[PDB]
Amino acid sequence: GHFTEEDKATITSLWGKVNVEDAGGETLGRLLVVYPWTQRFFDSFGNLSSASAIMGNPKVKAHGKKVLTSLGDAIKHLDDLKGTFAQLSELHCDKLHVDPENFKLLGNVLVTVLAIHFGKEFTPEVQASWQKMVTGVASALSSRYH
Protein backbone atom coordinates (compact mmCIF):
# COMPACT_ATOMS: atom_id res chain seq x y z
CA GLY A 1 0.00 0.00 0.00
CA HIS A 2 3.79 -0.06 0.35
CA PHE A 3 6.98 -0.83 2.27
CA THR A 4 8.97 -0.94 5.50
CA GLU A 5 12.63 -0.04 4.98
CA GLU A 6 13.57 -3.47 6.30
CA ASP A 7 11.31 -4.64 3.48
CA LYS A 8 12.90 -2.61 0.69
CA ALA A 9 16.49 -3.06 1.88
CA THR A 10 15.47 -6.71 1.54
CA ILE A 11 14.26 -6.94 -2.05
CA THR A 12 17.11 -4.60 -2.96
CA SER A 13 20.03 -6.84 -1.99
CA LEU A 14 18.51 -10.16 -3.03
CA TRP A 15 18.29 -8.44 -6.40
CA GLY A 16 21.87 -7.19 -6.66
CA LYS A 17 22.65 -10.91 -6.69
CA VAL A 18 20.28 -11.74 -9.54
CA ASN A 19 21.59 -12.36 -13.06
CA VAL A 20 18.58 -10.79 -14.78
CA GLU A 21 19.11 -12.19 -18.27
CA ASP A 22 19.07 -15.77 -16.99
CA ALA A 23 16.45 -15.56 -14.25
CA GLY A 24 14.03 -13.93 -16.68
CA GLY A 25 14.45 -16.53 -19.41
CA GLU A 26 13.52 -18.87 -16.57
CA THR A 27 10.31 -17.41 -15.15
CA LEU A 28 8.82 -16.59 -18.54
CA GLY A 29 9.89 -20.10 -19.51
CA ARG A 30 8.15 -21.65 -16.51
CA LEU A 31 5.09 -19.43 -16.87
CA LEU A 32 4.61 -20.82 -20.37
CA VAL A 33 4.97 -24.36 -19.04
CA VAL A 34 2.98 -24.34 -15.80
CA TYR A 35 0.15 -22.16 -17.10
CA PRO A 36 0.31 -23.25 -20.74
CA TRP A 37 -2.48 -20.96 -21.93
CA THR A 38 -0.06 -18.05 -21.59
CA GLN A 39 1.42 -19.78 -24.63
CA ARG A 40 -1.44 -17.75 -26.09
CA PHE A 41 0.47 -14.56 -26.90
CA PHE A 42 3.45 -16.29 -28.52
CA ASP A 43 3.38 -18.52 -31.60
CA SER A 44 5.38 -15.86 -33.43
CA PHE A 45 7.95 -17.74 -31.36
CA GLY A 46 8.38 -21.28 -32.68
CA ASN A 47 8.59 -24.64 -30.91
CA LEU A 48 6.61 -24.14 -27.71
CA SER A 49 5.70 -27.81 -27.33
CA SER A 50 7.46 -29.78 -24.59
CA ALA A 51 8.84 -28.17 -21.44
CA SER A 52 12.27 -28.69 -23.00
CA ALA A 53 11.66 -26.92 -26.31
CA ILE A 54 10.39 -23.93 -24.35
CA MET A 55 13.09 -23.54 -21.70
CA GLY A 56 15.51 -23.61 -24.63
CA ASN A 57 13.66 -21.39 -27.09
CA PRO A 58 15.73 -18.24 -27.57
CA LYS A 59 12.85 -15.89 -28.36
CA VAL A 60 11.42 -16.92 -25.00
CA LYS A 61 14.80 -16.41 -23.34
CA ALA A 62 14.96 -12.96 -24.91
CA HIS A 63 11.57 -11.44 -24.09
CA GLY A 64 12.00 -13.15 -20.73
CA LYS A 65 14.89 -10.78 -20.01
CA LYS A 66 13.19 -7.84 -21.73
CA VAL A 67 10.37 -8.25 -19.22
CA LEU A 68 12.63 -8.68 -16.19
CA THR A 69 14.83 -5.68 -16.95
CA SER A 70 11.63 -3.69 -17.40
CA LEU A 71 11.11 -4.89 -13.84
CA GLY A 72 14.59 -4.41 -12.37
CA ASP A 73 14.14 -0.75 -13.28
CA ALA A 74 10.97 -0.34 -11.22
CA ILE A 75 12.80 -1.74 -8.19
CA LYS A 76 14.18 1.80 -8.31
CA HIS A 77 10.97 3.80 -7.99
CA LEU A 78 9.32 1.45 -5.51
CA ASP A 79 7.69 4.68 -4.35
CA ASP A 80 5.46 5.25 -7.38
CA LEU A 81 5.25 2.12 -9.53
CA LYS A 82 2.06 3.48 -11.09
CA GLY A 83 3.94 6.43 -12.59
CA THR A 84 6.79 4.14 -13.63
CA PHE A 85 4.57 1.78 -15.61
CA ALA A 86 1.74 3.91 -16.97
CA GLN A 87 3.02 3.78 -20.54
CA LEU A 88 3.68 0.03 -20.43
CA SER A 89 0.22 -0.42 -18.94
CA GLU A 90 -1.54 1.63 -21.61
CA LEU A 91 0.39 -0.43 -24.15
CA HIS A 92 -0.44 -3.89 -22.83
CA CYS A 93 -4.12 -2.94 -22.82
CA ASP A 94 -4.55 -0.99 -26.05
CA LYS A 95 -2.15 -2.88 -28.30
CA LEU A 96 -1.11 -6.23 -26.84
CA HIS A 97 -4.44 -7.20 -25.30
CA VAL A 98 -3.01 -9.16 -22.38
CA ASP A 99 -5.36 -10.34 -19.63
CA PRO A 100 -3.70 -8.54 -16.73
CA GLU A 101 -4.46 -11.65 -14.70
CA ASN A 102 -1.18 -12.80 -16.25
CA PHE A 103 0.98 -10.27 -14.40
CA LYS A 104 -0.16 -11.99 -11.21
CA LEU A 105 0.56 -15.43 -12.65
CA LEU A 106 4.08 -14.35 -13.59
CA GLY A 107 4.57 -12.54 -10.28
CA ASN A 108 4.10 -15.92 -8.61
CA VAL A 109 6.28 -17.99 -10.93
CA LEU A 110 8.96 -15.39 -10.18
CA VAL A 111 8.75 -15.69 -6.40
CA THR A 112 9.18 -19.38 -7.18
CA VAL A 113 12.25 -18.98 -9.39
CA LEU A 114 13.77 -16.78 -6.69
CA ALA A 115 13.23 -19.50 -4.09
CA ILE A 116 14.81 -22.07 -6.39
CA HIS A 117 17.87 -19.89 -6.92
CA PHE A 118 18.58 -18.63 -3.41
CA GLY A 119 17.29 -21.57 -1.38
CA LYS A 120 17.41 -20.89 2.35
CA GLU A 121 18.41 -17.27 1.81
CA PHE A 122 14.89 -16.67 0.50
CA THR A 123 13.19 -16.71 3.90
CA PRO A 124 9.46 -16.41 4.57
CA GLU A 125 10.01 -12.79 5.59
CA VAL A 126 11.90 -12.04 2.38
CA GLN A 127 9.20 -13.69 0.27
CA ALA A 128 6.59 -11.53 1.99
CA SER A 129 8.43 -8.39 0.89
CA TRP A 130 8.49 -9.68 -2.68
CA GLN A 131 4.85 -10.79 -2.65
CA LYS A 132 4.18 -7.14 -1.87
CA MET A 133 6.41 -6.08 -4.76
CA VAL A 134 5.15 -8.55 -7.35
CA THR A 135 1.59 -7.62 -6.40
CA GLY A 136 2.22 -3.88 -6.72
CA VAL A 137 3.89 -4.39 -10.09
CA ALA A 138 0.95 -6.40 -11.42
CA SER A 139 -1.32 -3.71 -9.97
CA ALA A 140 0.51 -0.85 -11.68
CA LEU A 141 0.69 -2.70 -14.99
CA SER A 142 -3.10 -2.97 -14.83
CA SER A 143 -3.95 0.49 -13.52
CA ARG A 144 -4.84 1.62 -17.04
CA TYR A 145 -7.08 -0.98 -18.68
CA HIS A 146 -10.45 0.13 -20.03
Partner 1 sequence: VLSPADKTNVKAAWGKVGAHAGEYGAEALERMFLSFPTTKTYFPHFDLSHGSAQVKGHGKKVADALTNAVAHVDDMPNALSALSDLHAHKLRVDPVNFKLLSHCLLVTLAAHLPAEFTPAVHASLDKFLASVSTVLTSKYR
Residues that bind ligand HEM (CB under 6 A): 38, 41, 63, 66-67, 70-71, 88, 91-92, 96, 98, 102-103, 106, 137, 141
Q: Is 93 in the site for partner 1 (CB under 8 A)?
A: yes
Whether 138 and 105 have beta carbons less than 8 Å apart is answered as: no
With CB cut-offs between 5 and 8 Å by kind, which of ligand HEM, partner 1, none does residue 67 bind?
ligand HEM
Q: Is 42 in the site for partner 1 (CB under 8 A)?
A: no
Alpha helices in 35-123 (DSSP H): 51-55, 58-75, 81-91, 101-118
Whether 110 and 134 have beta carbons less than 8 Å apart is answered as: yes
The enclosing H or E element of 134 equals helix 124-142
Residue partners of 44: CB distance under 8 A and separation at least 6: 59
92 labelled ligand-binding: yes
Q: Which residues bind partner 1 (CB under 8 A)?
A: 29-30, 33-37, 39-40, 51-52, 54-55, 93, 97-102, 105, 108, 111-113, 115-116, 118-120, 122, 124-125, 127-128, 131, 142, 145-146
Q: Which residues are annotated as a binding site for heme b?
A: 63, 92
